[PDB]
Symmetry: C3
Subunit: 41 residues, 3 copies
């Protein structure tokens, strides 16, 4: 059972990392969209 938890924790860590990289990319795109909107005003 211990080894099964270790493997699922590793799976959760990879998904957690993937979500973190997606957050950073969405943050970049949002900041680019903010600048375009401000330039259009």
């Amino acid at each position: 059972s211990m080894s099964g938890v270790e493997q699922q924790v590793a799976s959760l860590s990879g998904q957690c990392h993937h979500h973190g990289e997606n957050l950073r990319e969405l943050t970049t795109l949002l900041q680019k969209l903010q600048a375009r909107v401000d330039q259009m005003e």
Copy 2:
């Protein structure tokens, strides 16, 4: 407790999937707003 840790990991797996759902929703709303800015 092995069972206890197993239930915590199932909890985190659920929060993970929920976060993944929120990311997809935020991505779709960003694409719609970006298209609205392009149309202007």
Copy 3:
């Protein structure tokens, strides 16, 4: 080991929650941008 696994689970739990707070942050900036763009049309 069971305590070592409880800690990694605790690591991940902290990150998940940080991720939630970043999602809420981005949702809010997106909602303010949506309003801003609505005022430009």
